[PDB]
Symmetry: D2
Subunit: 392 residues, 4 copies
């Protein structure tokens, strides 16, 4: 099958690519893959484990391999051995020039960039290129997935984002102030009939205009924002306090990392996107809302090794306060990368079983799962098993 990756030269993206190839050349195991669980025996019928990649980028790198080496140099998140073995495959994967429209202050920090707006094109022209790019690539087994830098919170317009009609008038009128890259990509994907996933907190296909378009074309989509670490933990074990009828009075989650993302998610301008994101999460599991703090800080030396420190303060019998601490030490790309392959496969699966619009039941992969209040990891996993089983 074919995967088109928005932000194709990033760590998550290339680790997923490196990984797809290593597994297919049979020199890496299938650990990490949700689609490779016993319960999903059968899915290779509808979406074999086989991947061809391309994607969009704004960064000035030569091909996927050069990108993967750069990330590997600073993180050694996998055996050098593995990288050298896929050097050739990844070298033949060259990204096409993207758009960074409305991507914020922090885009400097990617180093040297090249954009479609940088060539001085109209919105129509840019949309049109992105479309061309993917279509020349796309077959009937193609999915599009966004893994590009988190955008700020969009310049939200009722006119231009409230309806598909409105969104297209935005394109046609060349009204760039209203568009964000993620919208354009997602539009293009749904526009060409291609399943789309948003792995980021950027708006992507979340706006009503793109949900409308998704529904009308008959195209499945999912998101948003992959639940890969500390949040997976939170949503896996907050429910333990509800089951035991204990009152969580405070929850602290403090996470640190370096690399392109943490260095941008720093300034509380762009820091806003993951501070609402971890307590209304809690009320939807406990049915009340403890005092919750949620923070990410820059910490250069850690690079992609996002580390998180959680404290849970809770009352038990006779209201006695008690304490729970945990530390999460993982490489972000390693926990994310496989989910991109899982999502690609589940989405193709959904396409072929005729699913249209938002795939509620894929909540399991995300922190802002669209169209659902099912947040508790356990219920989510059951939901995904059961959605898979019923359609199979």
């Amino acid at each position: 099958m074919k995967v088109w990756l928005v932000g194709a030269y990033g760590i998550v993206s290339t680790t997923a690519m490196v990984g797809a190839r290593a597994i297919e050349r049979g020199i890496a195991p299938k650990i990490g893959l949700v689609s490779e669980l016993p319960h999903f025996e059968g899915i290779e019928k509808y979406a074999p484990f086989s991947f061809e990649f391309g994607g969009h980028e704004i960064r000035l790198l030569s091909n996927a391999y050069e990108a993967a080496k750069e990330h590997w140099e600073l993180n050694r998140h996998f055996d050098r051995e593995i990288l050298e073995a896929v050097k050739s495959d990844l070298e033949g994967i060259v990204a096409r020039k993207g758009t960074a429209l409305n991507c914020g202050s922090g885009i400097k920090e990617l180093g040297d960039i090249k954009t479609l707006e940088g060539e001085g094109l109209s919105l129509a022209e840019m949309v049109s290129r992105i479309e061309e790019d993917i279509k020349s690539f796309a077959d009937d087994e193609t999915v599009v997935i966004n893994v590009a830098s988190t955008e700020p919170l969009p310049n939200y317009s009722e006119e231009y984002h409230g309806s598909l009609e409105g969104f297209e008038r935005m394109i046609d009128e060349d009204r760039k102030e209203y568009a964000s890259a993620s919208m354009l990509y997602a539009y293009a994907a749904l526009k060409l009939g291609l399943p789309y996933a948003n792995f980021t907190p950027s708006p992507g296909s979340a706006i009503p205009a793109l949900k409308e378009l998704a529904e009308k074309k008959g195209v499945p989509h999912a998101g948003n924002d992959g639940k890969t670490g500390e949040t997976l933990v939170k949503t896996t074990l907050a429910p333990m306090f509800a089951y035991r009828n204990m009152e969580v009075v405070g929850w602290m989650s403090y996470a640190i990392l370096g690399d392109y993302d943490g260095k941008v998610l720093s300034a509380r301008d762009n820091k806003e996107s993951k501070v609402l994101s971890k307590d209304k999460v809690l009320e939807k599991m406990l049915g009340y809302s403890p005092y919750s703090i949620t923070e990410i800080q820059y910490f250069p030396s850690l690079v992609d090794n996002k580390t998180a420190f959680d404290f849970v303060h809770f009352k038990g019998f006779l209201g006695k306060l008690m304490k729970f601490y945990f530390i999460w030490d993982a490489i972000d790309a390693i926990v994310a990368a496989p989910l991109i392959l899982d999502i690609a496969r589940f989405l193709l699966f959904a396409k072929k079983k005729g699913v249209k619009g938002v795939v509620k039941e894929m909540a399991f992969f995300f922190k802002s799962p669209m169209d659902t209040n099912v947040i508790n990891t356990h219920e989510q996993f059951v939901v995904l098993k059961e959605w898979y089983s019923n359609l199979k």
Copy 2:
């Protein structure tokens, strides 16, 4: 309703009584009571939150209040005012001489004991004494619940544990060598047709002879070993790794604690009763069984304040190792006590609804749940609920 507590001047038992009476006196909240959770609404008409207490002990104190105060002095795990407000009630609660039969070398650590065997009695007699004690206290709404100190591994005997007939020939013969307190209390409870629960890892009613007795007498029973702290975290958190097809290469649980259960369990004699519990435990959620060390150690100054340390080492995508740490800081009688009153009510409910034998569906409370492979905190919770909804 009535609750006969085996080990009744224990900190769990006393905390239970203190909290039952405080809640009833309207002077403490109802946090921690699983039977108080919304899904369990209506349980009141079969098992109201109304409690009377008696029990067996081998410790020499005057009454439950002195026991309670003794633990409270060293522990201060509830407000002094609650202690005073419940004084006259627990002063009215007087345990009856029990049996230390085959309870391990470290029964020396409780210090001052008088026991039924200690009178030079026989099995036939001990048993009639234990029964008379209970029959004395019992109505149609009495449950017997074991929270006595953890017994060593019992001497094995298929003749005497294999079947009711064998056990009863054991009693008849006074073959004390193959008998243990937990068993005799269990036998007594079932021979009077009262529901029975085993909050401890002692064999209790779990031997085949006593399951048969329960079946034949038509009484519900449940256990074993209440799942209160760290093990709750383990059966809640381990499934996460399962859901993300991650391979745990190592699980470490080290816990320190003081108080009575500290010294005894740490040594050799009774430490062999919660080590074989946590890789077969893991095997039943991971589906495989990783290097798993499990250990408890004496640490005086901590008293009843069980502190556990856990390190989980797991591979994700591409074979890449990552680490997860947690620290559980709780007062053990606090997580334990409410579950005693929950086990009570739920047992009275089962009895009223015609349940007999093991109630598998009360696994949610136990570290070694009988007759179930369901160990996942979430699967056990759904199972508890469904059970309830299906008999309600």
Copy 3:
């Protein structure tokens, strides 16, 4: 000896009074007291363990006992019995009205205050009101220690803070814009010719004009800012890395607390008095400044129980990164309170031995020790000992 506490009704200050009295009455041990270490045997020659208290406050409560009861109610940081036994002496301690001048947006967070400038008074009357308050109380064995709420960064002025001439003019020409309470309190202790110590990040006697005052007056003074918890471990543990020629690539401190202080410092403009610190702390022990972050966050449920998480990333042989984690769990007032007395005893000694100006040698007590580069806790202790031995 007499001790005059600015911020008299605060937890830190009330706990010191409770401890002072409790130790005098013979109902508490002498743990926590640097002045009570065997090196300082001899000290009671000049600074015995006896204490009379007085103080300024701005909150309306009857006496130091109500002040202490409030704090204990929320915190339960010592036995009910300790409180009860000192009820008498502490009811005999009534704080006199002070100034809340320029003390931040968080002065709103203290509930109901009444203040000297609240009577619409002038800098000159306010100062002499302060001095007359301390002057009745004060004898030839009286010290003044500041434990008031953290002020924001002072309004910068080199005309008014650079010289005592400029400071007295500020007072003469009533320029409240350049004056904060902590400076006014300090000016008064020192004009009245009394030892002064500042246990807070506020300027206090550290403005140049005030050091000038203390020198010209020949008065000893110590400060600033108690090093009671997290920062103690930092100044004790950092050296280890320097001793083994390892390179700290990064250090994080993340503290949470509630209670009055957590409230006040939760505002951004009152938080700033603890961000620009433990970078320049680190370079003063390591000789290079690693990437450091320090943060305090409001966390209501913890009350005065500060809990700090630190992470240190560091390079050793062949530049391999390694990791060190720590969690600090203490009641702030408990660790603060003893030093208050310790400082009082040490200041009164200093004075008696004719010491004048900044007592560099009390660096051991402080996060921002004045006039000194000795930050290393061990180096700091040794100085405190030799300074003392050299005067004994």
Copy 4:
């Protein structure tokens, strides 16, 4: 200079050798070297950073590179490029074959082992062989350091370890029962007049006989048992409770690791060279002896990454109990390796200043420093600094 290494194919040893060649090759920096700290400027007039390696082993590996690589495969503790860079240097390093006498059950773990007593040799000629291997290799500027696997407790012979005569009688008389490998190589070193150091808890040169010899021959020597991680933290952190007049009421150290030594110290009978050695550590810094458990468990997946969990429970003002937790995560070979070279450098310096016998002043490097009580890292460092200055 020349360093002869006992256990030359170890991870500590081969990492030291890998590191030394990298630094000389100028392809890695000098992080981790105590001797490269400023206070020692000039140490190299007497002890340049210049190293030639030889040693004793029982494992069958071709040369020092095969060994380094084998460890590297499993640990990836330094860069694959460093290994290639130094391959040819390490390949010229062939270990000469030594003795495994009375190193107990934990020598079956190592693999294919060949020894001197394996040839059915007598103590006389095993020693002779050992001195012949070394003398051959050694010049006026050679050191012997022990980094071999930890022995079980030596067999007790007061006659044979009480005095030089005794010891050499043991040899002439072939009393194999009473010697072990540490003792033999140490004897062998001091006979040839080379300085000796013992990085292991093995007795080595610390028996009265062998220090008798060192004096007699005017040879300097140091040990025992490198202080590399957890214990370092402890000897650094415990004095903070002393300085602050607090009482430690319990200390827990729980360390897990895999690889050779983790295998070795798992079996209970070898775990006992670090059982008595950590309350007597605390005492020597604290004044009193608090409850203190120190434990090490096998954890295969960690390989050489010794992780440790510490919990200090402590009383402060008014007897209030507080908690401190830390987690050390390092690679034991990285923390150790530099100290091997440092130790060699200080030893040559010592030799060259006429120092003889136990050099107590090098305690800084050790867990059980010979002939000294100074345990506190801070004090040890100063002592190390001062000693060097006194002989500079």
